[PDB]
Amino acid sequence: TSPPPSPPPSPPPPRPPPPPPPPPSPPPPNRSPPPPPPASSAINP
Amino acid sequence: KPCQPGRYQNSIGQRVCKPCDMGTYSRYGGELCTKCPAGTVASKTGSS
Numbered sequence: 001t002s003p004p005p006s007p008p009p010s011p012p013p014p015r016p017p018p019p020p021p022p023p024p025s026p027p028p029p030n031r032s033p034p035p036p037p038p039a040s041s042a043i044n045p
Numbered sequence: 046k047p048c049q050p051g052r053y054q055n056s057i058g059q060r061v062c063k064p065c066d067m068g069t070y071s072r073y074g075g076e077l078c079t080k081c082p083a084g085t086v087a088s089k090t091g092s093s
Protein backbone atom coordinates (compact mmCIF):
# COMPACT_ATOMS: atom_id res chain seq x y z
CA THR A 1 0.00 0.00 0.00
CA SER A 2 1.08 3.57 -0.72
CA PRO A 3 2.52 5.82 2.00
CA PRO A 4 0.82 8.83 3.64
CA PRO A 5 0.96 12.54 2.69
CA SER A 6 4.54 13.71 3.40
CA PRO A 7 4.86 16.29 6.19
CA PRO A 8 5.16 20.09 5.79
CA PRO A 9 8.29 22.24 6.34
CA SER A 10 8.96 22.76 10.08
CA PRO A 11 9.12 26.36 11.28
CA PRO A 12 12.22 28.42 12.19
CA PRO A 13 13.51 29.44 15.67
CA PRO A 14 11.80 32.32 17.58
CA ARG A 15 14.50 34.81 16.39
CA PRO A 16 17.16 36.37 18.64
CA PRO A 17 17.01 39.59 20.70
CA PRO A 18 18.14 43.15 19.82
CA PRO A 19 21.38 44.97 20.72
CA PRO A 20 21.61 46.91 24.02
CA PRO A 21 22.13 50.70 23.98
CA PRO A 22 25.47 52.53 23.52
CA PRO A 23 27.47 54.33 26.24
CA PRO A 24 27.20 58.08 26.91
CA SER A 25 29.26 59.97 24.29
CA PRO A 26 32.25 61.78 25.81
CA PRO A 27 32.38 65.53 26.58
CA PRO A 28 33.65 68.32 24.28
CA PRO A 29 37.31 69.41 24.59
CA ASN A 30 37.88 71.76 27.56
CA ARG A 31 38.01 75.27 26.16
CA SER A 32 41.09 77.40 26.73
CA PRO A 33 41.24 80.61 28.79
CA PRO A 34 41.55 84.17 27.42
CA PRO A 35 44.52 86.54 26.96
CA PRO A 36 46.00 88.75 29.70
CA PRO A 37 45.05 92.44 29.23
CA PRO A 38 47.86 94.84 28.20
CA ALA A 39 50.24 96.31 30.80
CA SER A 40 48.51 99.43 32.07
CA SER A 41 50.39 102.68 32.57
CA ALA A 42 51.25 104.41 35.83
CA ILE A 43 48.45 105.74 38.03
CA ASN A 44 47.85 109.45 38.47
CA PRO A 45 50.62 111.24 40.41
CA LYS B 46 59.30 97.42 47.76
CA PRO B 47 59.42 94.35 45.51
CA CYS B 48 56.48 92.00 45.18
CA GLN B 49 56.37 89.18 47.71
CA PRO B 50 56.66 85.55 46.57
CA GLY B 51 53.47 84.37 44.93
CA ARG B 52 52.77 87.82 43.45
CA TYR B 53 53.71 89.58 40.22
CA GLN B 54 53.39 93.07 38.76
CA ASN B 55 53.99 93.76 35.06
CA SER B 56 53.20 97.50 35.07
CA ILE B 57 55.12 100.58 36.16
CA GLY B 58 53.88 102.89 38.88
CA GLN B 59 51.34 100.63 40.59
CA ARG B 60 50.60 100.23 44.29
CA VAL B 61 49.38 96.61 44.25
CA CYS B 62 50.91 93.23 43.39
CA LYS B 63 48.66 90.69 41.75
CA PRO B 64 48.49 87.00 42.72
CA CYS B 65 49.60 84.27 40.34
CA ASP B 66 47.00 81.81 39.11
CA MET B 67 47.27 78.09 39.77
CA GLY B 68 50.09 76.23 38.04
CA THR B 69 52.52 79.17 38.27
CA TYR B 70 54.97 80.21 40.96
CA SER B 71 57.01 83.34 41.61
CA ARG B 72 59.92 84.23 43.87
CA TYR B 73 60.60 87.72 45.23
CA GLY B 74 59.59 90.60 43.03
CA GLY B 75 59.29 89.60 39.40
CA GLU B 76 57.70 90.99 36.27
CA LEU B 77 55.71 87.84 35.52
CA CYS B 78 54.85 84.49 37.06
CA THR B 79 56.75 81.58 35.54
CA LYS B 80 55.02 78.28 34.82
CA CYS B 81 56.01 75.28 36.91
CA PRO B 82 58.62 73.20 35.05
CA ALA B 83 57.75 69.82 33.60
CA GLY B 84 57.29 67.28 36.39
CA THR B 85 56.41 69.66 39.24
CA VAL B 86 53.15 71.06 40.57
CA ALA B 87 51.65 74.12 42.26
CA SER B 88 48.09 73.92 43.57
CA LYS B 89 47.01 77.23 45.15
CA THR B 90 47.16 80.81 43.86
CA GLY B 91 49.62 82.06 46.48
CA SER B 92 52.20 79.55 45.29
CA SER B 93 55.78 80.65 45.86
Ligand SMILES: *[C@H]1O[C@H](CO)[C@H](O)[C@H](O)[C@H]1O
Pocket residue numbers: 001002003
Ligand atom coordinates in the same frame (compact mmCIF):
# COMPACT_ATOMS: atom_id res chain seq x y z
C1 LIG C 1 1.26 4.08 -3.88
O1 LIG C 1 2.39 3.10 -3.71
C2 LIG C 1 2.07 1.75 -4.22
C3 LIG C 1 3.34 0.94 -4.24
O2 LIG C 1 4.22 1.41 -3.24
C4 LIG C 1 1.48 1.77 -5.63
O3 LIG C 1 2.51 2.15 -6.55
C5 LIG C 1 0.34 2.74 -5.76
O4 LIG C 1 -0.06 2.81 -7.16
C6 LIG C 1 0.71 4.10 -5.30
O5 LIG C 1 -0.46 4.94 -5.34
Ligand SMILES: *[C@H]1O[C@H](CO)[C@H](O)[C@H](O)[C@H]1O
Pocket residue numbers: 003004005006007
Ligand atom coordinates in the same frame (compact mmCIF):
# COMPACT_ATOMS: atom_id res chain seq x y z
C1 LIG D 1 7.23 12.18 2.50
O1 LIG D 1 6.86 11.50 3.79
C2 LIG D 1 6.16 10.23 3.57
C3 LIG D 1 5.92 9.56 4.89
O2 LIG D 1 4.91 10.25 5.58
C4 LIG D 1 6.98 9.29 2.68
O3 LIG D 1 8.16 8.91 3.39
C5 LIG D 1 7.38 9.94 1.39
O4 LIG D 1 8.32 9.06 0.70
C6 LIG D 1 8.02 11.27 1.58
O5 LIG D 1 8.16 11.91 0.29
Ligand SMILES: *[C@H]1O[C@H](CO)[C@H](O)[C@H](O)[C@H]1O
Pocket residue numbers: 007008009010011
Ligand atom coordinates in the same frame (compact mmCIF):
# COMPACT_ATOMS: atom_id res chain seq x y z
C1 LIG E 1 8.64 20.14 11.82
O1 LIG E 1 7.25 20.42 11.32
C2 LIG E 1 6.96 19.66 10.09
C3 LIG E 1 5.53 19.90 9.70
O2 LIG E 1 5.08 21.12 10.26
C4 LIG E 1 7.19 18.16 10.26
O3 LIG E 1 6.16 17.62 11.09
C5 LIG E 1 8.52 17.84 10.89
O4 LIG E 1 8.53 16.44 11.26
C6 LIG E 1 8.80 18.65 12.10
O5 LIG E 1 10.16 18.40 12.51
Ligand SMILES: *[C@H]1O[C@H](CO)[C@H](O)[C@H](O)[C@H]1O
Pocket residue numbers: 022023024025026
Ligand atom coordinates in the same frame (compact mmCIF):
# COMPACT_ATOMS: atom_id res chain seq x y z
C1 LIG F 1 28.74 59.67 21.05
O1 LIG F 1 29.61 58.48 21.32
C2 LIG F 1 28.82 57.30 21.70
C3 LIG F 1 29.74 56.11 21.74
O2 LIG F 1 30.30 55.99 23.03
C4 LIG F 1 27.67 57.01 20.73
O3 LIG F 1 28.22 56.47 19.52
C5 LIG F 1 26.88 58.25 20.39
O4 LIG F 1 25.93 57.95 19.33
C6 LIG F 1 27.77 59.33 19.94
O5 LIG F 1 26.99 60.50 19.60
Ligand SMILES: *[C@H]1O[C@H](CO)[C@H](O)[C@H](O)[C@H]1O
Pocket residue numbers: 030031032033
Ligand atom coordinates in the same frame (compact mmCIF):
# COMPACT_ATOMS: atom_id res chain seq x y z
C1 LIG G 1 43.74 75.88 25.66
O1 LIG G 1 43.44 75.19 26.97
C2 LIG G 1 42.72 73.92 26.81
C3 LIG G 1 42.74 73.19 28.13
O2 LIG G 1 43.78 73.70 28.93
C4 LIG G 1 43.34 73.01 25.75
O3 LIG G 1 44.58 72.50 26.25
C5 LIG G 1 43.60 73.73 24.46
O4 LIG G 1 44.30 72.84 23.55
C6 LIG G 1 44.42 74.94 24.68
O5 LIG G 1 44.58 75.63 23.42
